[PDB]
Amino acid sequence: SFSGYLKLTDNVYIKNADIVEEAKKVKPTVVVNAANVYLKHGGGVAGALNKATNNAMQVESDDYIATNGPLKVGGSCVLSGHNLAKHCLHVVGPNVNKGEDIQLLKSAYENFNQHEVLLAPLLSAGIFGADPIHSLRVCVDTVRTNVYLAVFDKNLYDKLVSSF
Ligand SMILES: O=C(O)[C@@H]1CCCCCN1C(=O)c1ncnc2[nH]ccc12
């Protein structure tokens, strides 16, 4: 099970950890990917999760897009977790660096409510350009299921806990 997490609320927990290493250790039922609408896992959390699957996540993702088309910003799909988890919930938060509406961040976090427990990053943070403090606030105020957040950056983890 999950270990070394700080409890933020009844259902939200947080740890300074690499989500790839956390997924390999825990093998959770669901790992969340910070996806884009095309499921092109080039960089950030998505690039790191995909590289850990030896590109099997990208091959499966390309078949899903060829069949279904792109996701919506704020939407999600469930695919295999490969060697990292039973399932990967690919969730698209708004990318501020591309001009997307930040109000869609709450819709993106609502996808987590379909799963009892998840290992996840903060959506729309990092290379997606949103303020991670805002993303954690929206997470706590939207998700009702058990979420284990992994924050890679130590300095950002410390700021997120101290300002919570
Ligand atoms: O979790 C983090 O600290 C980072 C960076 C800023 C905060 C937002 C989340 N985030 C990422 O999206 C990320 N980006 C690229 N590679 C990564 N490896 C693990 C996480 C990760």
At a glance:
The chain is of the alpha/beta class and 164 residues long. Helices cover 35% and strands 20% of the residues. It has one domain (6-161): Leucine Aminopeptidase, subunit E, domain 1 (3-Layer(aba) Sandwich), CATH 3.40.220.10.
Number of strands: 7
Distance between the termini: 25 Å
Helix-strand pattern: EEHEHHEEHEHEH
CATH architecture: 3-Layer(aba) Sandwich
Give structural notes.
The protein is an alpha/beta fold and 164 residues long. It is 35% helix and 20% strand. Strands 1-2-7-6 form a four-stranded mixed sheet, with helices on both faces. Strands 3-5-4 form a three-stranded mixed sheet, with helices on one face. It is globular and about 45 Å long. The two termini are 25 Å apart. The relative contact order is 0.21. Bound molecules: ligand A1AJH. The ligand O=C(O)[C@@H]1CCCCCN1C(=O)c1ncnc2[nH]ccc12 binds next to helix 2. Ligand A1AJH binds next to helix 2. The PDB classes it as viral protein, hydrolase. The entry lists the keywords asap, AViDD, Diamond I04-1, crystallographic fragment screening, PanDDA, XChemExplorer, SARS-CoV-2, viral protein, hydrolase. It forms a monomeric assembly.
List keywords for this structure.
alpha/beta; globular; 20% strand; four-stranded mixed beta sheet; Papain-like protease nsp3; Leucine Aminopeptidase, subunit E, domain 1; three-stranded mixed beta sheet; viral protein, hydrolase; 164 residues; 35% helix; binds ligand A1AJH
Write the layout of secondary structure elements.
Elements: E1 6-7, E2 12-16, H1 19-26, E3 30-34, H2 44-52, H3 56-68, E4 76-80, E5 87-91, H4 104-110, E6 117-120, H5 132-142, E7 146-151, H6 154-162
Parallel strand pairs: 2-7, 3-5, 6-7
Antiparallel strand pairs: 1-2, 4-5
Helix pairs in contact: 4-5
The chain binds the ligand O=C(O)[C@@H]1CCCCCN1C(=O)c1ncnc2[nH]ccc12.
Subunit structure: May form homohexamers. Interacts with N protein.
Membrane topology: Multi-pass membrane protein
Subcellular location: Host endoplasmic reticulum membrane
